[PDB]
Design a protein around this motif. Sequence first.
Motif, PDB file in Angstrom:
ATOM      1  N   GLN A 173       0.834  -1.216   0.000  1.00  0.00           N
ATOM      2  CA  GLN A 173       0.000   0.000   0.000  1.00  0.00           C
ATOM      3  C   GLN A 173       0.872   1.270   0.000  1.00  0.00           C
ATOM      4  N   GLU A 174       0.479   2.275  -0.799  1.00  0.00           N
ATOM      5  CA  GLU A 174       1.164   3.559  -0.855  1.00  0.00           C
ATOM      6  C   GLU A 174       0.419   4.501   0.053  1.00  0.00           C
ATOM      7  N   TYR A 175       1.108   5.026   1.055  1.00  0.00           N
ATOM      8  CA  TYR A 175       0.522   5.885   2.066  1.00  0.00           C
ATOM      9  C   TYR A 175       0.821   7.333   1.841  1.00  0.00           C
ATOM     10  N   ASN A 176       0.030   8.190   2.470  1.00  0.00           N
ATOM     11  CA  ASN A 176       0.263   9.614   2.417  1.00  0.00           C
ATOM     12  C   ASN A 176       1.520   9.903   3.248  1.00  0.00           C
ATOM     13  N   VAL A 177       2.459  10.686   2.696  1.00  0.00           N
ATOM     14  CA  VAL A 177       3.692  11.026   3.435  1.00  0.00           C
ATOM     15  C   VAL A 177       3.491  12.216   4.384  1.00  0.00           C
ATOM     16  N   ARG A 178       2.337  12.917   4.308  1.00  0.00           N
ATOM     17  CA  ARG A 178       2.042  14.064   5.165  1.00  0.00           C
ATOM     18  C   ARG A 178       1.477  13.571   6.499  1.00  0.00           C
ATOM     19  N   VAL A 179       2.327  12.895   7.264  1.00  0.00           N
ATOM     20  CA  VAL A 179       2.001  12.361   8.581  1.00  0.00           C
ATOM     21  C   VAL A 179       3.173  12.735   9.471  1.00  0.00           C
ATOM     22  N   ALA A 180       3.000  12.593  10.804  1.00  0.00           N
ATOM     23  CA  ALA A 180       4.012  12.942  11.819  1.00  0.00           C
ATOM     24  C   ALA A 180       4.392  14.434  11.839  1.00  0.00           C
ATOM     25  N   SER A 181       4.789  14.913  13.006  1.00  0.00           N
ATOM     26  CA  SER A 181       5.206  16.298  13.163  1.00  0.00           C
ATOM     27  C   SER A 181       6.610  16.437  12.589  1.00  0.00           C
ATOM     28  N   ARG A 182       6.915  17.602  11.987  1.00  0.00           N
ATOM     29  CA  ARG A 182       8.195  17.862  11.285  1.00  0.00           C
ATOM     30  C   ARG A 182       9.424  17.219  11.913  1.00  0.00           C
ATOM     31  N   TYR A 183       9.666  17.497  13.207  1.00  0.00           N
ATOM     32  CA  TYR A 183      10.934  17.043  13.813  1.00  0.00           C
ATOM     33  C   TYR A 183      11.048  15.538  13.987  1.00  0.00           C
ATOM     34  N   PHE A 184       9.907  14.827  13.844  1.00  0.00           N
ATOM     35  CA  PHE A 184       9.813  13.366  14.040  1.00  0.00           C
ATOM     36  C   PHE A 184       9.616  12.623  12.731  1.00  0.00           C
ATOM     37  N   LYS A 185       9.591  13.350  11.603  1.00  0.00           N
ATOM     38  CA  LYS A 185       9.352  12.708  10.304  1.00  0.00           C
ATOM     39  C   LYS A 185      10.548  11.852   9.894  1.00  0.00           C
ATOM     40  N   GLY A 186      10.257  10.597   9.516  1.00  0.00           N
ATOM     41  CA  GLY A 186      11.269   9.687   9.018  1.00  0.00           C
ATOM     42  C   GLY A 186      11.782  10.141   7.649  1.00  0.00           C
ATOM     43  N   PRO A 187      13.023   9.756   7.309  1.00  0.00           N
ATOM     44  CA  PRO A 187      13.566  10.083   5.972  1.00  0.00           C
ATOM     45  C   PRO A 187      12.673   9.588   4.843  1.00  0.00           C
ATOM     46  N   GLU A 188      11.948   8.461   5.063  1.00  0.00           N
ATOM     47  CA  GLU A 188      11.045   7.938   4.014  1.00  0.00           C
ATOM     48  C   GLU A 188       9.984   9.000   3.650  1.00  0.00           C
ATOM     49  N   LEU A 189       9.444   9.722   4.649  1.00  0.00           N
ATOM     50  CA  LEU A 189       8.461  10.782   4.382  1.00  0.00           C
ATOM     51  C   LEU A 189       9.136  11.957   3.664  1.00  0.00           C
ATOM     52  N   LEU A 190      10.345  12.308   4.108  1.00  0.00           N
ATOM     53  CA  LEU A 190      11.076  13.463   3.600  1.00  0.00           C
ATOM     54  C   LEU A 190      11.553  13.324   2.160  1.00  0.00           C
ATOM     55  N   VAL A 191      11.704  12.079   1.700  1.00  0.00           N
ATOM     56  CA  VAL A 191      12.096  11.804   0.313  1.00  0.00           C
ATOM     57  C   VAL A 191      10.866  11.325  -0.512  1.00  0.00           C
ATOM     58  N   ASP A 192       9.640  11.404   0.076  1.00  0.00           N
ATOM     59  CA  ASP A 192       8.365  11.085  -0.590  1.00  0.00           C
ATOM     60  C   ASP A 192       8.272   9.606  -0.996  1.00  0.00           C
ATOM     61  N   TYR A 193       8.850   8.705  -0.174  1.00  0.00           N
ATOM     62  CA  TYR A 193       8.724   7.258  -0.411  1.00  0.00           C
ATOM     63  C   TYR A 193       7.424   6.795   0.306  1.00  0.00           C
ATOM     64  N   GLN A 194       6.397   6.446  -0.479  1.00  0.00           N
ATOM     65  CA  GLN A 194       5.089   6.152   0.071  1.00  0.00           C
ATOM     66  C   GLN A 194       4.874   4.748   0.612  1.00  0.00           C
ATOM     67  N   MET A 195       5.721   3.783   0.239  1.00  0.00           N
ATOM     68  CA  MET A 195       5.458   2.395   0.665  1.00  0.00           C
ATOM     69  C   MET A 195       6.141   2.089   1.993  1.00  0.00           C
ATOM     70  N   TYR A 196       5.847   2.906   3.009  1.00  0.00           N
ATOM     71  CA  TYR A 196       6.480   2.742   4.306  1.00  0.00           C
ATOM     72  C   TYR A 196       5.664   1.837   5.220  1.00  0.00           C
ATOM     73  N   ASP A 197       6.139   1.640   6.464  1.00  0.00           N
ATOM     74  CA  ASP A 197       5.462   0.698   7.338  1.00  0.00           C
ATOM     75  C   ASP A 197       5.695   1.075   8.815  1.00  0.00           C
ATOM     76  N   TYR A 198       5.470   0.126   9.730  1.00  0.00           N
ATOM     77  CA  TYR A 198       5.645   0.305  11.165  1.00  0.00           C
ATOM     78  C   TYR A 198       6.958   0.977  11.552  1.00  0.00           C
ATOM     79  N   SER A 199       8.026   0.723  10.770  1.00  0.00           N
ATOM     80  CA  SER A 199       9.368   1.218  11.077  1.00  0.00           C
ATOM     81  C   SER A 199       9.413   2.757  11.087  1.00  0.00           C
ATOM     82  N   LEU A 200       8.402   3.447  10.509  1.00  0.00           N
ATOM     83  CA  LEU A 200       8.346   4.910  10.632  1.00  0.00           C
ATOM     84  C   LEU A 200       8.267   5.277  12.156  1.00  0.00           C
ATOM     85  N   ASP A 201       7.482   4.507  12.946  1.00  0.00           N
ATOM     86  CA  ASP A 201       7.363   4.780  14.378  1.00  0.00           C
ATOM     87  C   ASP A 201       8.668   4.646  15.121  1.00  0.00           C
TER      88      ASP A 201
END
Length: 327
Positions: free
Chosen positions: A184-212
């Motif tokens: 599943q391709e997820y929206n990368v506009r999640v998490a507060s700026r300072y806590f955003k994973g590199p996957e969100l910052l490079v617009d990689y949508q197929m992320y998972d639990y490891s973002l937490d």
Amino acid sequence: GPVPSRARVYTDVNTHRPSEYWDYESHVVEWGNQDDYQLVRKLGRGKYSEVFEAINITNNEKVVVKILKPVAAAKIKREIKILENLRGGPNIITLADIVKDPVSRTPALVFEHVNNTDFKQLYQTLTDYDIRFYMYEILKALDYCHSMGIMHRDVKPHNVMIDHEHRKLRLIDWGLAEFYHPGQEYNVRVASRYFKGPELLVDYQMYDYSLDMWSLGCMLASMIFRKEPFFHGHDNYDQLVRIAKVLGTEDLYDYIDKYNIELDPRFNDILGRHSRKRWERFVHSENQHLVSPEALDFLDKLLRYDHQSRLTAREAMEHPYFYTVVK
Ligand SMILES: Cc1cc(F)ccc1-c1ccc(C[NH3+])cc1Cl
Ligand SMILES: Cc1cc(F)ccc1-c1ccc(C[NH3+])cc1Cl
Ligand SMILES: Cc1cc(F)ccc1-c1ccc(C[NH3+])cc1Cl
């Protein structure tokens, strides 16, 4: 195009559970009685809700009422289904009831009350032992929700309530949480700026639990190094540059090359070339009491660009950093 990715754990959870478990659009809400609750004081407001301390008049107990602002109906049903699925899980906030607020004409979620100790007081006075203890308590909540096929996607200190007097922790605000479905391709506009994973910052949508687990590492780094926030970006672009000044640009390029991701060309004017830094560089006389070789090793295993390389919550629980914690 981008190389697909799957979690290395809990990929099959939503496959083997019945469709009623994750199909939140089909969920029928069991409405409670709004008259059982009397609002006492407003605690705060965000872009998604107004939060109140209230009393449940059927038993005189303090509750917290989250009155939802009108947003896409799918977001409301998703939060309710996730909260019901996770209810009773370790350190997960308990959804006590769902009522229709007569004034807002929207759903009001009723939660157990947590006597949340002042955040500034916790940040300033938690000891090395207390940080380990509460980090272990947060890992229980994250391994539970990931084992249940859910990613929180908004892990940060404001979403962790601690009643320090009773050593009680709850993970709250499941409004951005989602069910993990492989591929599943997820929206990368999640998490507060300072806590955003590199996957969100490079617009990689197929992320998972490891973002937490990235967000958890940001929390730990700020706490042990006394540097709030640890990665202090002026915006989402400068956020990645701040990460790259610590983790290095060569490992950033290895990450985006592994997944066949191209950086936004606006990075050419701001990224530069940065070596990976040793974690000991951040140690000084005012934070040494919170640091140890075990804390640094653990932090190094959370704050990794490659989301597939980070410790999972269950592996993190086995780490030497928690050996001192009474279990
Ligand atoms: C703040 C808001 C925004 C809306 F667009 C609609 C309703 C509300 C709202 C109105 C009253 C209350 C108190 N029951 C709460 C909310 Cl969220
Ligand atoms: C206990 C802890 C440990 C960390 F490593 C980082 C932050 C925190 C923390 C600090 C304050 C609060 C109160 N909202 C919550 C947490 Cl998890
Ligand atoms: C001197 C050192 C070097 C490292 F590489 C990692 C940790 C430490 C270290 C050891 C003990 C303490 C005392 N709380 C602090 C530190 Cl930073």
